Design a protein around this nucleic acid. Sequence first.
RNA 1: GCGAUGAUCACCCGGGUGGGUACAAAUGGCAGUCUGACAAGU
RNA 2: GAGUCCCAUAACCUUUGUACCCCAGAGUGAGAAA
Lengths: 232, 121, 139, 199, 45, 409
Amino acid sequence: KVVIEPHRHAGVYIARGKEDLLVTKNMAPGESVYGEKRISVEEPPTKVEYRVWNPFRSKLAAGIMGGLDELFIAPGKKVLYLGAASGTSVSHVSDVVGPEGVVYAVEFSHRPGRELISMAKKRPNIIPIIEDARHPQKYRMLIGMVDCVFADVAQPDQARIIALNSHMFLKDQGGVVISIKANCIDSTVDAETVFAREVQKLREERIKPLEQLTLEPYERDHCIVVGRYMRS
Amino acid sequence: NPKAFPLADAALTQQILDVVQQAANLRQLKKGANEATKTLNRGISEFIIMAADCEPIEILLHLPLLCEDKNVPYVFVPSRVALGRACGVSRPVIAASITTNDASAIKTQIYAVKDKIETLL
Amino acid sequence: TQDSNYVRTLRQIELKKLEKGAKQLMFKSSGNHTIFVDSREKMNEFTPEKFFNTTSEMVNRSENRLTKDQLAIMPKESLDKKKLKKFKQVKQHLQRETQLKQVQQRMDAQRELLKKGSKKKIVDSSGKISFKWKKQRKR
Amino acid sequence: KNDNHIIQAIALLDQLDKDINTFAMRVKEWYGWHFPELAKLVPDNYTFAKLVLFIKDKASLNDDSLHDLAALLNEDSGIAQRVIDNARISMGQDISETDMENVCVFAQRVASLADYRRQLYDYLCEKMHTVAPNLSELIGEVIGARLISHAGSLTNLSKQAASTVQILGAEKALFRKNKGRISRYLANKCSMASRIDNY
Amino acid sequence: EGTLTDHERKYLNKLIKRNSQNLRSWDLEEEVRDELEDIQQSILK
Amino acid sequence: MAYVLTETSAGYALLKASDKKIYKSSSLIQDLDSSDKVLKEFKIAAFSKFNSAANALEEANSIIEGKVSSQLEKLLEEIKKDKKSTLIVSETKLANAINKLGLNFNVVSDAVTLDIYRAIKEYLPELLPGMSDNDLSKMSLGLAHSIGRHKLKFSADKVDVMIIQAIALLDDLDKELNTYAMRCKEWYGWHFPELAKIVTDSVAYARIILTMGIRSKASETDLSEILPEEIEERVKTAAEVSMGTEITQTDLDNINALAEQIVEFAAYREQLSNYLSARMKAIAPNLTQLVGELVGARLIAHSGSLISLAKSPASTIQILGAEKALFRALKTKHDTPKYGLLYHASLVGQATGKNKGKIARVLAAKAAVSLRYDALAEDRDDSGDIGLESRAKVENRLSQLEGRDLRTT
RNA sequence: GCGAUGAUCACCCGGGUGGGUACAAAUGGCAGUCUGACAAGU
RNA sequence: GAGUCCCAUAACCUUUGUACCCCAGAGUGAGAAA
C-alpha cells in the first residue's frame, strides 16, 4: 500500500511509496475536479480519499516543492484567492483550509467563471465571486476577513490589485502570496530584475516580504513572493 | 467586431501576410478553420491567424479557447479576402495556421512574427 | 494517405501515454530560494538550520522540510530500481513519440510532391533536399 | 392446475424492482440539480418520489407546507425542519417549469410501478397458495415461485430427483458444514412438497 | 517553558535522529539521484 | 451623531458611533483592535434583515451599481429624527447617491474610515447577536451563487445537461417498454395465443386487452378504433377457435394493470420526445434546423457537452458515432468510415448512392458552423436564422449533386 | 427416546490474509476522433 | 477520396461497494449414536 505521510504544512500530505506525489484530502469524495488521480488509504481502519496535486498545473503546488518556509494557508483559515481561472488550483486550496475555513474565489472572464460555479456547488466552503479584482469595492459585501491573500493574476498592474484588496480585506499580520510572471511585466530584462521591482512595489504598499522562490523547472521565469501585511 | 481581439494594426498585418505567403509556397501552411483546429490538437501549430470580418464571427471563436489551453499565440487580421490571396487560394479563408518545422528555410521569419504576436496578446 | 493515418494514430497514442506518465512522477524543484532579513547583523549570522528549525540534512530536502517538532517491508534498493524504471519508461515514451513525428513529417513532405503543382528541387551544400513551389495561385 | 402464471409474475417482480430502482435514481438526479440536498435528506427513493411530488419548487416554503411535508413520513428524523432550512439556503440552480413538469410526471411514473409491483406481489402470493400450498408453506411464496421457474414447471420440479432439486436453487441459495446439512435436508422436503402439489 | 534538563535535551535529540534515519530511507540515497536527475531533465526539456 | 453604513449578506447594519469625528482620529487601529472596544464605540441603530434571496439579489445588485435601494431608503428614513448627524459610508459612489437623496446627514467617505470597516467587519459575528459565523458564511455562499448566476446571465432554459439526461433516459424507455410488450404478448398469450401473429404493434396489442378482456368478449367488443376492418374480424374469428385456456378475473385484473402500464409508457415516451424537442429548440436551435432534434441531441450527448462538441472540427462531427470502425481501420491500414452518427439525419437519407458520402461531408461542415454559433454566441436569438440559411445551402448542394446522372444519355 | 418419507461423505496472527459466484458504480485501462482543393457543365 | 451496417447507445480487463460461498453432481446410497 501507499504510505501517506504528513508534510510540513498542515493540510498537505505526500502519498510516499513507489510513486510519490503531493496530495490533499478530498473535500467531496468520489470525484475529481479536473481528472487528476485519486488515492484512498485506510487509517485506524477507515479509508480517506485523497486527490493528487500536480505542480505543473497549480503554481501554489509549484511553491510547495520549492520548499516555501511559511504558507499562511492552513486548516481553519479564511483565504482570498485572486484570479480563479477555474478549480484547477482552488479545489486544492479548499482542501487545505478544511470545512472550518472558507475560500473567496475571484474571477473576471465569463467562460471560465461558469466552470468555477460548476465546482463551487460541490465545495460548500468555496464562495465564488465573478467580478474584476481591480474594483474590490464591488464584492465587499460577500467577503469576510481573510488570513491570507493569494494572487495568480497575470497583469502588468497586479501590485495595485493586491494593495487595494489587502487594504480592505486582509487582517493585520496576515498573509500575502503573489505569483509573478516576468514576461508579462517586462520581457526585455532578465526575470530576476523584474522580481526585485515587484518586491519594492509591495514594500511601498505596507507589505513586508519574507521569502522569494523561483519555480523552475515547473515553469520558466516565474517566482512566488511571500510577505506579511504590516499595517502599523 | 469587438469580439475579435487582439486585432493587428496596419504595420503588423503586412508582416503576418508576408509570412503567410512564404509559408504557403513552402507548403507549411494549413488553410481554413477546420484544418487549424486539428493542428492545435496535434500540437504542430506555430501560431494562428484569423479574419475579423467573418460573419457570423463565432464560427472561428472556438479557436481562441483552444489556443489559451495549449498556449499558442494568435492574431486577427482585418479582412478575410486579403488572407485568402495571401494564402494562395481563390476563396475567402477565415483562419490559417503555420505548421511547426524547425528545419524550415523561413524559420527565423516565423519566430520574429510569433514574438510580436505574443507581445500583442 | 493511409500510412500517414496509421503513423499519426500511433503518435497520438504516445503523447497521451507521455502526458499520463509525466503526471504520475514528481520532479524535484531546482530554483533559488532567497530570504529577506531586515538587519545586516541578522544577515551575517543567518544559518539555514536556525531559520528552518531543522536538522541540517533536513534543510536540503526541498519538498518536505520538517521543523524539529514534527520529527519528534520492501528492500529500498529494490524500490529504487523500480522508481528508476518508472522514469526510464516515460523517456522511452518521449523518444517513440519523437521518432513517429520525424517519420510523419518526411511522409507528409512526399505527399506534397504527389499533389499537383510546379516544383523545383533545391540542394544545400550540406546535401539537404528541399522543394520550393512556384508562386502560382490554386484554381 | 396452471403454474405458468407463477413463472411469469416472478419475472415481473424482479423486473419492476430493477426499473423502479433505475427510474427512481433518475428522479434523484433530475431533482438533484434543482436541489441536491434533499436527495441526502430522504435516502428512501420511494419517499423521495412522493416528497418531490409535493415540494416541487423549493422557494415555496410555508409553515402550513412544513406541516404537510411533516405529515409525509415522520418528523422523528427531523427531515421536515431540515428541508425548510436547506430550502431557504442552497446552491441548487432553479430549472424551468417544463423541466419541473417532467420530474414530477417522471416521478409519478415511478410511483405507479411501485404501486403496481405491490399489487402484483399480492397476486403472486395468492396464486402460490392456490397452486402450490405445500411448497409455498415450506419455504415461501416468492422462493417457491422462483424454484418453479428454475425447473421450468411445477411438473418438471416434481419429476426431478432430490439431489437435482438441491442444485436447482444452488445459484441463488434458495434453500439456504452444519449449514450444508440443513440445506440438503430441506432440499428433500421441498421435493416432497412439490410432488404433493403437482399431482 | 524552556525548562529542559540536559537529560530532556538528550531524549528529544535521539527522536530527531530516530525519525530522520527513518525518513532518510524514504528520502533515499544520493547515487540513484544522479541517474534519476539526468532522466528528469530529459522529460522536462 | 456619527453613523456607519455597513452592508452584510444578512442585510444592512447601521451603527451609531459615539464620537462625531471618529473618522478624524489617527489611532483607529489601536482603538478598535478588540470586540469590546468596537461594541462600546458602535451601537446598532436599525437592522432590517433580508427576507428572501430574491430580495437579496435585487438589493445586492443595487450596491454593485451604487444605487440606494428602497430597503436602504426606509432604514435610512427612520434615523432622520437626529438633526445634524454624520453618516460614514464605505464607498464614494454610494455616498454620493445618498447625498443626492437630500437627507439631513453629512455623508463621509474617506481613507481613514477604512480602518473602521476593517475593525467592524472583523468582529461582525460578535457585533451582530443571534447570527453565528456558520450561518453568515452559509448565506454568503447562496448569495454568491445567486449573483454569480445573474452576472453570467445563467438562464434555466439554456442548460445542456437536461439534453444529456433526456436522451439517455429516452433510450432506456424504449427497451423497458419493449420488454414489457414481449411478455404481455406471452402472458395474455396463454389465454389467447393467436393475437400476436395478427397484431404486431405493442400499444395496439395492449389496447386490445383493455377493450376486451376475454375471447368471449371478442364477439360484442368493437376494435374499430384500434384495428382496421380486415384485421379486427381476424381476432374475432381466432377468438372462438382459440387453443388457450380460461383465466380468472384475478389474472385478468392483473394483466389489465400491465396493459394499462404499456399505454402509459407509450404516452410518456411521446411526452419526453416533445420535451426533448423543446429543449433542443432553445439550447442549440441552429443545429436543430439543420440536422434535427433527435440526431442533434445524440451529438451533444456523445461529446458530453455542447461546448465540447463546438471545439470539435467538422471532420470529427462527420464520423462521431463510429469510432470503432474508424480506429480499427486506421490501425489496420484500411479505408475509414464515412457516416458515423449522422447517417440518421434526414438530408443524408434523401441522398442516394455515393451522394450520401458527399452530403455527410457537406452537412457535417455546416453542422459545425451552425453549432459554433449556438454555443459561443453571447446575444444569440432563439430563432435559428443561421441554420436555416445553412439548410438552404445543403439543400441546393444536394439538388445539383443528385441531379447528375452517371449514365450517358 | 434416529434413519430409504434418505444415514454417511486454503493461509497467517478471539482476530487478519487468499480464493470463488451474482449485481451496481468509476471524469479507471485498452483508447488514439478521417483526408484537405478541386468538381460539374458547353 | 473514404467499411454506419463486428450494437463506443457497446465488449473485455482493473478498482471499489453490497449479498453470499470455501462439499461431491446424472453426486454417492445405509449407516448414525453408543
